[PDB]
Amino acid sequence: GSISTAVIDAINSGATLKDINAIPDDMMDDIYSYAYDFYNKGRIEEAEVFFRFLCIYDFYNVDYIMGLAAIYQIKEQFQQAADLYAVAFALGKNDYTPVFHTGQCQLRLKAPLKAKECFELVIQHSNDEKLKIKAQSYLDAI
Amino acid sequence: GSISTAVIDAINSIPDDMMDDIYSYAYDFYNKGRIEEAEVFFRFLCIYDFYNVDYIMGLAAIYQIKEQFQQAADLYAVAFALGKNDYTPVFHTGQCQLRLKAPLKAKECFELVIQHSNDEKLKIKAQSYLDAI
Ligand SMILES: N=C(N)c1ccc(C(F)(F)F)cc1
Ligand SMILES: [Cl-]
Ligand SMILES: [Cl-]
Ligand SMILES: [Cl-]
Ligand SMILES: [Cl-]
Ligand SMILES: [Mg+2]
C-alpha cells in the first residue's frame, strides 16, 4: 500500500489514490465486482457505498462513475445522476449511453425540452442502432 | 481539476449578471496574455457553476494553449454534452486528439463537424484537418 505521507500528498495535490497505486489492481476489480453483485441483488445501499468508494479511488474511471450514476438514478437523485452521466460521457467521448440516461433523468426533473435534446443527440450522433431505438421510443412519446 | 471537483461534489452530495462580470474579467486577462490569471478565474467559475458551457469552453481553451491536450479534450466533451448544438468543442477535441497521437478519434471528431455543423467556416477548418489525416 501507500505510506501516509504519500496519501496526504495526493489529497493535497488533487491526485487519485489510483495514481499512487494505494490498493492492488486485483483488489479493485474485486470491489467493482462486489459492487455489481450488490446492485444485481437489490442491495442498493451497499452498492452505493462501494461505488462511492470506487469513485473516490479513481474519479476518472468511466465505469466507476457510471455505476454511481445508475445508483443515484435508482434512488431518484436525478440531478446528481445527470451530473455524473455528463462526466462519464466526456471521459469516454464515444458512448452515447450516458446521454440516453441523462434524458431519462431530465424527464423526471420536469425538464422535457432538455430530455428531448438528450435523446436527439443520441439519435443524431450514435452509431449504436439498438441504443437509438430506445432513445427514439422516448422521443416518439414526447 | 475541474472534473475531479465535479465528481467529488457528486459523491458527497449570485445573480447571473455578476457571474457574467467575472467571466468578462477572465476574458480580459486572457486577451492581454495573462493566461495564468485567466485560468484562475475560469477555474473559479467552473467550481461555482461547472455545468455552464461558456465557463467550460474558456477553461478548455486555456488548457489547449498550454498543451494540456487531454484535460482540454475532456472539458470540450463536457461542453458538447451540455450544449449539443455548437460543434466548436468537437472541432477543438479533434485538434487535441491529433496532438495526443489519436488520429482515428480526431478523424471521428472532424467528420461529426462536417456532417452536423451549420457553421460553414468551421466545416472548412475540419475538412482541412481531414485532408491531412
Ligand atoms: N440512418 C442513417 N443513414 C445513418 C447515417 C449515419 C449514421 C452515423 F454515422 F451517424 F452513425 C447512422 C445512421
Ligand atoms: Cl505510513
Ligand atoms: Cl479521450
Ligand atoms: Cl426543459
Ligand atoms: Cl457549430
Ligand atoms: Mg450540413
Elucidated via: X-ray
Instruction: Tell whether B75 lies on the interface with A, counting CB pairs under 8 A.
Output: yes
Query: How is A33-79 classified by DSSP, letter by letter?
Result: HHHHHHHHTT-HHHHHHHHHHHHHH-TT-HHHHHHHHHHHHHTT-HH
Report the residue from B51, B105, B112 with minimal CB separation from A83. Answer: B51
A6: number of Cβ within 10 Å: 16
What's the CA-to-centroid distance between B125 and ligand 6, angstroms? 14
Cell 432538455, residue located? A114
List the grid coordinates of A1. Answer: 500500500
CA distance B93 to B89: 6
> From B3, which residue of chain A is nearest by alpha-carbon distance?
A87
Instruction: Tell whether B82 lies on the interface with A, counting CB pairs under 8 A.
Output: yes
CA distance A37 to B85: 39
CA distance A128 to A141: 20
Q: What is the resolution of this structure in A?
A: 1.7
Instruction: Tell whether A122 lies on the interface with B, counting CB pairs under 8 A.
Output: no
A87–B3: do the CB atoms touch at under 8 Å?
A: yes
A55–B11: do the CB atoms touch at under 8 Å?
A: yes
> From A53, which residue of chain B is nearest by alpha-carbon distance?
B11
**Closest to B77 measured CA to CA, from B65, B62, B88, B68:** B88
- What lies within 8 Å, CB to CB, of A88 at 6+ separation is A62, A65, A66, A69, A98
List the grid coordinates of B38. Answer: 485567466
Backbone angles phi, psi at B119, to 5 degrees: -90, 100
CA distance B7 to A74: 18
Instruction: Quickly list H helices, B13-87.
Output: 16-31, 35-48, 53-65, 69-83
C-alpha to C-alpha distances, A109 to A53, A77, A114, B55, B107, nearest whole angstrom: 27, 10, 10, 24, 36
Cβ distance B114 to B127 under 8 Å?
Answer: yes
Helix axes B2-12, A78-92, angle to 10 degrees: 150
Cβ distance B98 to B132 under 8 Å?
Answer: no
Chain A residues whose beta carbon lies within 8 Å of the beta carbon of residue B9:
83
**Interface mutation vs chain B, best among A65, A87, A94, A100, most B CBs within 10 Å:** A87
**Closest to B93 measured CA to CA, from B62, B120, B114, B72:** B72
Q: Can you give the residue ranges of every domain in chain A?
A: 1-142
* The amino acid at B108: E
Cβ distance B46 to B77 under 8 Å?
Answer: no
Report the residue from A72, A80, A86 with minimal CB separation from B81. Answer: A86
Can you list the pairs that B35-42 forms with residues at least 24 positions away whose Cβ atoms lie under 8 Å? B35/B62, B35/B65, B35/B66, B38/B62, B39/B66
Cβ distance B112 to A125 under 8 Å?
Answer: yes
Chain B residues whose beta carbon lies within 8 Å of the beta carbon of residue A65:
7
C-alpha to C-alpha distances, A112 to A70, A77, A107, B100, nearest whole angstrom: 20, 17, 5, 37
List the grid coordinates of A94. Answer: 464515444
Cβ distance A98 to A66 under 8 Å?
Answer: yes
CA distance A32 to A46: 12
Can you list the pairs that B102-106 forms with residues at least 24 positions away whose Cβ atoms lie under 8 Å? B103/B133, B105/A93, B106/B133
Helix (H) or strand (E) holding B2: helix B2-12
